[PDB]
Amino acid sequence: SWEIDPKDLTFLKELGTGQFGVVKYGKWRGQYDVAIKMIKEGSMSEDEFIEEAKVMMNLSHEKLVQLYGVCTKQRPIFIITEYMANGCLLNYLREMRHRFQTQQLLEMCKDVCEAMEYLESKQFLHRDLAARNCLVNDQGVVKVSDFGLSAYVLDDEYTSSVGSKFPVRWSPPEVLMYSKFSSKSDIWAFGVLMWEIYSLGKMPYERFTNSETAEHIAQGLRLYRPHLASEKVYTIMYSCWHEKADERPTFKILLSNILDVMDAN
Numbered sequence: 001s002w003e004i005d006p007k008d009l010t011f012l013k014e015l016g017t018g019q020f021g022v023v024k025y026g027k028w029r030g031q032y033d034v035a036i037k038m039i040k041e042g043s044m045s046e047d048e049f050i051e052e053a054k055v056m057m058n059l060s061h062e063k064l065v066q067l068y069g070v071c072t073k074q075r076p077i078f079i080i081t082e083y084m085a086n087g088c089l090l091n092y093l094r095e096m097r098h099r100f101q102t103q104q105l106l107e108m109c110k111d112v113c114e115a116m117e118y119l120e121s122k123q124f125l126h127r128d129l130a131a132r133n134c135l136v137n138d139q140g141v142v143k144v145s146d147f148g149l150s151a152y153v154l155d156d157e158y159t160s161s162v163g164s165k166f167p168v169r170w171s172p173p174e175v176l177m178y179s180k181f182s183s184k185s186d187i188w189a190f191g192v193l194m195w196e197i198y199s200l201g202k203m204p205y206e207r208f209t210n211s212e213t214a215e216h217i218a219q220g221l222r223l224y225r226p227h228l229a230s231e232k233v234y235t236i237m238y239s240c241w242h243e244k245a246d247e248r249p250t251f252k253i254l255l256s257n258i259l260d261v262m263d264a265n
C-alpha cells in the first residue's frame with residue numbers, strides 16, 4: 001500500500017541475488033538506507049503479492065526487518081525493505097565464530113523470538129524461518145526477514161516438498177506429509193534456528209540428503225545438543241520439535257523460557 005516513488009530511490013551497491021533475483025543497497029530521498037529487491041519477471045506471483053502486500057507492511061516491530069513499501073507501476077516491481085549492514089545471520093555466525101560469547105547467542109535467540117511472538121499475535125505465518133532469512137544490523141541486532149513471502153515464489157524446486165530448494169531441514173512432519181502450515185510449523189523452524197545459532201552456523205542434518213532428513217525426523221531423529229548450548233537452552237530448542245504440533249510451545253512461552261534463562265544467568 002505505500003507505493004514508493006521510484007524517482008526517490010538511488011541505487012548504490014549490488015548486494016547479490018536471491019530467489020527473486022537482484023537485490024541492491026540504496027537510499028530513499030538521499031538519506032535512508034534501504035535494500036531493494038528487483039523482482040525478476042517470472043519469479044513471483046505478482047498480482048497475488050500486490051493484492052496482499054498491505055498486510056505485510058502493517059507488520060511493525062523492532063525485531064522484524066520492515067517492508068517499507070513497493071514500486072508496482074513499472075516492471076520489474078521493487079520491494080523496499082530495512083537495510084541491515086551485517087547481512088544474513090548465517091554468514092554472520094560463520095564469519096565471526098571465534099568472537100561470540102554464549103550470552104550473545106542467547107540474545108540472538110531472544111531477538112528472533114520477540115519478532116515471532118509478534119507475528120504469532122497477528123496470526124501471521126513466516127513459513128521459511130531460518131538463519132539465512134534473518135539479517136543483522138550494524139549494532140549486532142538480529143531481525144527476521146521476508147516473513148510471508150514464501151507464498152509468492154514461482155519455482156517448483158522450492159514449492160514442492162521433494163524439490164531441491166524446499167526447506168526440508170526446517171520443516172515439521174506435518175508440513176512434509178500434508179503441507180499443513182501453522183504457527184506450530186514456525187515453532188519447529190525456530191528450534192532449528194536456535195540450533196543454527198548455537199552451532200555457529202552449521203548445516204542441520206549435514207551429510208543427510210533432504211529425503212533422508214524427512215525419513216529420519218519422521219521416525220524421531222533429532223538434532224544433537226551443540227557444545228555451546230547449556231542443557232537449559234537445549235531443552236528450549238528441543239521443545240520445538242514435538243512430533244505432535246499441539247504439544248509444541250507458543251512463541252509467548254518460548255520467550256518466557258528464554259528470559260528465565262537470562263535472569264538465571
Ligand SMILES: Cc1c(NC(=O)c2ccc(N3CCCCC3)cc2)cccc1[C@@H]1C=NC(=O)C(Nc2ccc(C(=O)N3CCOCC3)c(N)c2)=N1
Pocket residue numbers: 015016017018019020023035037081082083084085086087088128133135145146147148149150151153
Ligand atoms: C535478502 C537478500 C537476498 N535474498 C533475497 O532477496 C531473498 C531471500 C530468500 C527468499 N525466499 C523466498 C521468500 C521467503 C524467504 C525465502 C527470497 C529472496 C539476496 C541478497 C541480499 C539480500 C539483503 C537484503 N537486505 C539487506 O539489508 C542485505 N544486506 C547485506 C549487507 C551486507 C552484505 C555483505 O556484502 N557483507 C556482510 C557484511 O560484511 C561484509 C560482507 C550482504 N551480502 C547483504 N541483504
